[PDB]
Design a protein around this ligand. Structure first.
Ligand SMILES: CN1CN([C@@H]2O[C@H](COP(=O)(O)OP(=O)(O)OP(=O)(O)O)[C@@H](O)[C@H]2O)c2nc(N)[nH]c(=O)c21
Ligand SMILES: Nc1ccn([C@@H]2O[C@H](COP(=O)(O)OP(=O)(O)OP(=O)(O)O)[C@@H](O)[C@H]2O)c(=O)n1
Ligand SMILES: [Mg+2]
Lengths: 186, 734, 48, 60, 159
RNA sequence: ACCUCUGCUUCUGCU
RNA sequence: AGUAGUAACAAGAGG
């Protein structure tokens, strides 16, 4: 799940730059990246990047860690991928992220999507690539017998004595007691 | 090249396999340990070690870069640096001549930010430069240990609020997830952020100083006078074992400190006045002579909006309009109708804790206003009958609700305290019951809210309801808690009689002096009563020591007067302050006991005892009243704890030390005056000497009445002693 | 705080610092590229 | 304050002989188990570790 | 006058005077009596209802929040990996490093309690490997050796 | 001989 | 010898 989510995110912004002018470009090989990839940064590092962006733009900081930020739209991106449906899932995500400016963009393995207000900030070409890859994954998930498995998916502190320490404990008691557990009960 | 030099350095390090291993295998978390990895030990005798090293040529460790920044040898041929690396680093060993060289001839930076970064320090000098000195006076005063504030100019933030703020100010991009709720936080941030832009002093020092400045710090110190932080800061200068150096620091007071001192002054004046023959005249005198830091108390009382019972008695006397209210939890409380009366009683909290606590019993009605919220409250004995509440936000209506639930004194809030809440500090000092509860339920009301309950509301819609959630709710609410939306602030003309009872124009009783809190607080700012009715040295301990010191030093005159003209002695005005230390209910009997005993000493010649006289004399100073009670001690209230002064011999409070030949009162010498028969211990009896089983079993004191003229006994007189007493054949009238 | 390596944190920080410096004008576009370049070379060198 | 006027009062200025040598890890174990009564067993057992180790200590 | 036993793990001779015979003179005694201690502690519980519970609660929170680096705050510390004293932080690092080389690394969480777990778990090891400097030699402690070092307090005189 | 290094570092604890 | 005082120093280590 996480592996795929990550790949999607990397795809969304790879070979997507901005000129010294300041216009969307796409290139294989002066430029500067178009998005900031936030997903897959360790939590603490990620918040630093968010903060640096928000302090630059004087925009409000989101309650949750987004997956991308776009230096052209000046928008934080959230991304999801679902072996389920594109709309029962979206509506859960928009709810969780209620009341903060975050462009959502679902994709399913079928190879169909659903942006917010069906306004796409990425070109069809680059969006096709992702829809392609999502299906091909469903295809190799099903051949191996995994795709059925995949699509379906506080504890109290523990502290106890391993054998040696247990034996030490048993020998650390007033003389009438045979073992640590008997002494603790008394 | 912002970022240029550091990434290039990083490149070079990663080219080394070792360094790369470290940087790839050490978590940020684990860096906290390896950061301290060292063979170097914390010097254990730094004084010796420095005396040793300062004999050496190159005792100082400096950055490698010193080698580029200063000459290797100075004009006199002193070597300033060497290429020897200090153990465990890339620092190099250098001479102290390098420091001097740098200070005479090195690079000159500009220091514009220094005052602002080190403001906490510079302010100290500012206060001193603009300080005023008065005279030094010499006297003994008890310096009682208490916790006091030590850093003027803090912003009253917790360490986590300070951290949050300092993170925003100094290292904004490293803040992490959450950001600042408080507006105090936000305006400090902007101010500081604006003061410290382009600042090139190390961020370590800036954070350090901000933390020192912004967080309230305290310490336990022996302190006789003003407890304000600006006075604490110069305690070494203003207070000695036998002296006070009168002093006023430069700068403004805190409004908080002034308000606090105004209350203490007003209470002191009221308590002193109540024991005068003409309270109102005495109160006015003191009001008109008193100052707080050289400001006349009269002017403060005219300009100061504090509503408090003693303050208001003073305002009334002076013809100043009052808002017949008090403060509690930041909200102002006007009593509309009804009344109640102060009674202390034991109280088990849900914390599981016994506690004496003054509890108001009776029917009362309160209009309540704060800056964001307001309410109407009806109250019984620990009864929240009803609270109608309004304000700007839900938040602000909530915060007042909490306050009112706590103010009720209800069992349900009493027995909703959870976790760590105690009524005595670490030093065993009693704390304010009600302020403790308030602070607790403002930290966390969840138990309180759940423990309270609910109520089904009617369709007279407009009388809305609030749920144990904190939620807005139409049909249900809490119990007694409702929501709704001219002259609450409006100050009225009152009148005041000779005994300080305050009434409106219609002539209803608004305030009586018996409603004034008995708490003896310590003033944040200096009070000078400048009054013949007050000891020059302030405070309860000082009433005790001053009075006894005064008796002793004037003993020759006072003795003759004890012999020739007692009643004039007893009525002297110098004994009135001391009267305020005696429980009201005991003054007359204590006086009657004392006068009787003193007459016995006169009648029974040869039994004069100057110490016994000095000791009991101040207790003579109230219209007497005879009784059957024998006293083994008199109670004195010092700082809300009773001390007992033993009638017979020495006590912790009052003792004559043979060895020094001094009288010691609360641990302080107050100087010295310089047969077996004791005439002035028991009413009606004489002590002859040591016990004698001849005259039968040892009786308590409270079993002596059942004797008769001339008849004797053995008595457990106190402090373990047994003595032979005789009932007197004639008794003394007084 | 973090489970990230010292190196990874420094790389992530250099990159995003260089980007803000660029927008805000504290740094040239040339400098900026060299920073992201140095970063990439560090990324690589970290694989032996 | 809590005393009656008829009571004598004495103070011992007090010190103990070889305090540390006569303290006992087994007793500390008892104290820790009793103080932590009713608490989660992981925490009781965690806190009991120090006394147990002291019962089994050696001195270089 | 107490009871001697041989420790199963270290072979140490261990004297136990608890619930031993009552003192018979005024000489210093270690014959503390469990039931008497318990009576006293119960007395303290009864005098201060809720005190034990609160102090426990705070201690639990502390156990959850404390970072491993808290142990850097000590002074000279016996360092079993060297059989010599070292600054506390250096001693901590050495333990962590040798632990991880021998397969104990719950402490990577950064939580003190996880380091405590590693400690107890380290006693199950057949032979803890450390390195001495002759250049560099790997030395294997016996299970017994290791446990003895773990249970060691180094000693010196008070100046 | 003479050379080199070292001057708290095999030894300074605990709330 | 001297310092010291329940055990040390009166140089140590290495070449
Ligand atoms: C619950 N309360 C509290 N209270 C008033 O609350 C005011 C301040 O609260 P407090 O806790 O008594 O503080 P106070 O004694 O002034 O503080 P200090 O320790 O400085 O003396 C007092 O003036 C007191 O009269 C009340 N007054 C009336 N009439 N009825 C009540 O039910 C209550
Ligand atoms: N420098 C010190 C001094 C004392 N203590 C602790 O304080 C206790 C009491 O110290 P002291 O009365 O000086 O010694 P005792 O061990 O009681 O021995 P004695 O009084 O018989 O000399 C010690 O046992 C020890 O736990 C300590 O840890 N460090
Ligand atoms: Mg002792």
């Amino acid at each position: 799940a996480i592996s795929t989510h990550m790949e999607v995110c990397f795809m969304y912004s790879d070979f997507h730059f901005i000129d010294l002018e300041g216009n969307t470009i796409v290139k294989e090989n002066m430029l500067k990246h178009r998005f900031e990839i936030i997903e897959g940064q360790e939590r603490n590092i990620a918040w630093t990047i968010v903060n640096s962006i928000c302090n630059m733009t004087e925009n409000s900081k989101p309650r949750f860690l987004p997956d991308l930020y776009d230096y052209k739209t000046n928008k934080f991106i959230e991304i999801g991928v679902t072996r389920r449906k594109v709309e029962d899932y979206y509506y859960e995500k928009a709810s969780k992220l209620k009341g903060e400016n975050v462009y959502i963009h679902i994709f399913s393995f079928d190879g169909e999507e659903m942006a917010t207000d069906d306004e796409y900030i990425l070109d069809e070409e680059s969006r096709a690539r992702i829809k392609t890859r999502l299906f091909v994954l469903r295809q190799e998930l099903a051949t191996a017998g995994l795709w059925d498995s995949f699509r379906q998916s506080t504890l109290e502190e523990e502290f106890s004595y391993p054998p040696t320490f247990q034996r030490l404990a048993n020998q650390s008691l007033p003389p009438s007691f045979k073992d640590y557990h008997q002494f603790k009960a008394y | 090249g912002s970022g240029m030099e550091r990434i290039k350095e990083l490149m070079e390090m990663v080219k080394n396999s070792r360094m790369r291993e470290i940087l790839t295998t050490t978590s940020v978390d684990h860096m906290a340990v390896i950061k301290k990895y060292t063979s170097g030990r914390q010097e254990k005798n730094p004084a010796l070690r420095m005396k040793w090293m300062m004999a050496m040529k190159y005792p100082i460790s400096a950055s490698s870069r010193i080698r580029e920044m200063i000459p290797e040898k100075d004009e006199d041929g002193n070597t300033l640096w060497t290429n020897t690396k200090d153990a465990g680093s890339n620092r190099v060993l250098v001479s102290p001549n390098a420091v001097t060289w740098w200070n005479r001839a090195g690079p000159v930076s500009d220091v514009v930010h220094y005052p602002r970064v080190y403001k906490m320090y510079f302010d100290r000098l500012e206060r001193l430069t603009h300080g005023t000195f008065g005279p030094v006076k010499f006297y003994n005063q008890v310096k009682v240990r208490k916790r006091v504030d030590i850093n003027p100019g803090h912003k009253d933030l917790t360490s986590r609020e300070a951290q949050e703020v300092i993170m925003e100010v100094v290292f904004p991009n490293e803040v992490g997830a959450r950001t600042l709720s408080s507006d105090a936080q936000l305006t400090i941030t902007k101010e500081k952020k604006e003061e410290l832009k382009n600042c090139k002093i190390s961020p370590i020092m800036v954070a350090y100083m901000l933390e020192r400045e912004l967080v309230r710090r305290t310490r336990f110190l022996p302190i006789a006078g003003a407890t304000s932080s600006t006075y604490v800061e110069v305690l070494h200068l203003t207070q000695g074992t036998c002296w006070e150096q009168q002093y006023t620091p430069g700068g403004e007071a805190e409004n908080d400190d002034l308000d606090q001192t105004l209350i203490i002054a007003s209470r002191n004046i009221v308590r002193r006045s109540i024991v005068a023959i003409d309270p109102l005249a005495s109160l006015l005198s003191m009001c008109h002579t008193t100052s707080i830091s050289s400001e006349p108390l009269v002017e403060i009382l005219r300009s100061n909006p504090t509503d408090e019972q003693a303050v208001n008695i003073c305002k009334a006397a002076l013809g100043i309009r009052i808002n017949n209210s008090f403060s509690f939890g930041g909200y102002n409380f006007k009593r509309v109708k009804g009344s109640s009366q102060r009674t202390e009683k034991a109280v088990l909290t849900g914390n599981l804790q016994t506690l004496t606590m003054t509890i108001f019993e009776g029917y009362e009605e309160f209009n309540v206003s704060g800056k964001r919220a307001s309410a109407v409250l009806k109250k019984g004995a620990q009864r929240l009958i009803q609270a109608i509440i309004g304000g700007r936000t839900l938040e602000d209506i909530l915060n007042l609700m909490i306050t009112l639930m706590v103010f009720s004194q209800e069992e349900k809030m009493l027995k909703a305290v959870r976790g760590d809440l105690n009524f005595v500090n670490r030093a065993n000092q009693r704390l304010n019951p009600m302020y403790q509860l308030l602070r607790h339920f403002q930290k966390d009301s969840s138990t309180l809210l759940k423990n309270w309950g609910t109520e089904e509301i009617d369709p007279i819609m407009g009388i809305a309801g609030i749920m144990p959630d904190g939620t807005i709710n139409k049909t249900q609410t809490l119990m007694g808690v409702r929501l709704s939306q001219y002259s609450f602030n409006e100050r009225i003309r009152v009148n005041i009689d000779k005994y300080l009872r305050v009434r409106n124009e219609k002539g209803e009783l608004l305030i009586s002096p018996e409603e004034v809190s008995e708490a003896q607080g310590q003033e944040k700012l200096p009070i000078n009563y400048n009054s013949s009715l007050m000891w020059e040295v302030n405070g309860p301990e000082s009433i005790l020591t001053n009075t006894y010191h005064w008796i002793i030093k004037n003993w020759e005159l006072l003795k003759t007067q004890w012999m020739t003209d007692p009643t004039v002695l007893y009525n002297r005005i110098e004994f009135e302050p001391f009267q305020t230390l005696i429980p009201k209910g005991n003054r007359a009997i204590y006086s009657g006991f004392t006068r009787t005993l003193f007459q016995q000493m006169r009648d029974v010649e040869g039994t004069f005892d100057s110490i016994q006289i000095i000791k009991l004399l101040p207790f003579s100073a109230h219209p007497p009243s005879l009784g059957r009670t024998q006293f083994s001690s008199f109670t004195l209230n010092i700082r809300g704890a009773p001390l007992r002064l033993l009638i017979r011999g020495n006590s912790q409070v009052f003792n004559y030390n043979q060895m020094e030949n001094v009288i010691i009162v609360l641990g302080k010498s107050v100087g010295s005056p310089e047969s077996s028969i004791e005439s002035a211990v028991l009413r009606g009896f004489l002590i002859l000497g040591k016990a004698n089983s001849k005259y039968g079993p040892v009786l308590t004191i409270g079993e002596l009445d059942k004797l008769g003229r001339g008849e004797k006994a053995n008595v457990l007189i106190g402090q373990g002693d047994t003595v032979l007493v005789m009932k007197r054949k004639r008794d003394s009238s007084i | 705080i973090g489970m990230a390596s010292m190196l990874d944190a420094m790389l992530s920080r250099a990159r995003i610092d260089a980007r803000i410096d660029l927008e805000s004008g504290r740094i040239s576009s040339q400098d900026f590229s060299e920073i992201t370049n140095t970063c990439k070379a560090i990324e690589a060198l970290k694989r032996q | 304050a809590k005393s009656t006027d008829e009571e004598l009062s004495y103070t011992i200025t007090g010190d103990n002989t070889k305090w540390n040598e006569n303290q006992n890890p087994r007793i500390f174990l008892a104290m820790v188990l009793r103080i932590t009564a009713g608490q989660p067993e992981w925490f009781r057992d965690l806190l009991a570790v120090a006394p147990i180790m002291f019962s089994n200590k050696v001195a270089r | 006058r107490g009871i001697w036993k041989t420790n199963s793990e270290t072979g140490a001779q261990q004297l136990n005077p608890i619930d031993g015979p009552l003192p018979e003179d005024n000489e210093p005694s270690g014959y503390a009596q469990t039931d008497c201690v318990l009576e006293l502690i119960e007395g303290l519980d009864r005098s201060h209802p809720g005190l034990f519970e609160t102090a426990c609660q705070e201690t639990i929170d502390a156990i959850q929040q404390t970072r491993v680096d808290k142990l850097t705050q000590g002074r000279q510390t016996y360092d079993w990996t060297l059989n010599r004293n070292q600054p506390a932080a250096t001693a901590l690092a050495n333990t962590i490093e040798v632990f991880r080389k021998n397969g104990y690394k719950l402490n990577e969480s950064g939580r003190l309690i996880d380091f405590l777990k590693d400690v107890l778990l380290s006693f199950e090891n057949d032979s803890m490997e450390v390195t001495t400097h002759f250049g560099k030699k790997r030395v294997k402690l016996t299970k017994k050796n290791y446990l003895i070092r773990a249970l060691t307090l180094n000693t010196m005189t008070k100046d």
